[PDB]
Amino acid sequence: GSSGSSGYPIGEASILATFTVTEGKKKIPVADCRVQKGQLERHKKFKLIRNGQVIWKGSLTSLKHHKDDISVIKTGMDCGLSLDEEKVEFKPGDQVICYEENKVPTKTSWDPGFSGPSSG
């Protein structure tokens, strides 16, 4: 039916590499993506975009920032997420949009602002 609820993307993450992991015996697939913009919150929903099409849609099952049970992933931070639907597969050419499903904001504020001088 309807693809994507009324809302907005919290942060976009691209998959640089993809691999699998072992836990006890099973083999859980993992996807390494580097937050290019925004952050990833271990709660919201996610989806894997490959070639522009979505393959998996929903919330992750687990998230880790390399030996560190974190919840939020800032920018420039590498983290690996795994989907419950092992069926789904990733690749170094997909996208991970972490949006919120509930409603849509109104956005009532417009004002630019930048800063980044040079030193040394």
CATH number for 73: 2.40.30.10
Per the entry, the structure determination technique was NMR
Q: How many CB atoms lie within 10 A of CB 51?
A: 10
Instruction: Give the dihedral sign, CA 26/79/41/51.
Output: negative
Q: Is residue 92 within 8 Å of 17, Cβ to Cβ? A: yes
Q: What does the block give as tokens for 67?
A: 């030996």
- Over its C-alpha atoms, the chain yields an Rg (Å, rounded) of 16
Distance CA 67, CA 116 (A): 32
Distance CA 60, CA 31 (A): 11
Strands 40-41 and 62-64, how do they pair?
unpaired
Q: Is residue 60 within 8 Å of 44, Cβ to Cβ? A: no
Q: Which residues span the domain enclosing 17?
A: 8-100
Distance CA 47, CA 4 (A): 10
Q: What single DSSP character describes residue 43?
A: T
User: Which has the closest alpha carbon to 79: 99, 58, 96, 56?
Assistant: 96
Q: Is residue 107 part of a domain?
A: no
Q: How many domains does the chain have?
A: 1
Q: What single DSSP character describes residue 65?
A: S
Q: Integer distance in angstroms from the first to the last C-alpha of the chain? A: 56
Q: Is residue 110 part of a domain?
A: no
User: Which has the closest alpha carbon to 96: 78, 120, 71?
Assistant: 78
Distance CA 98, CA 92 (A): 18
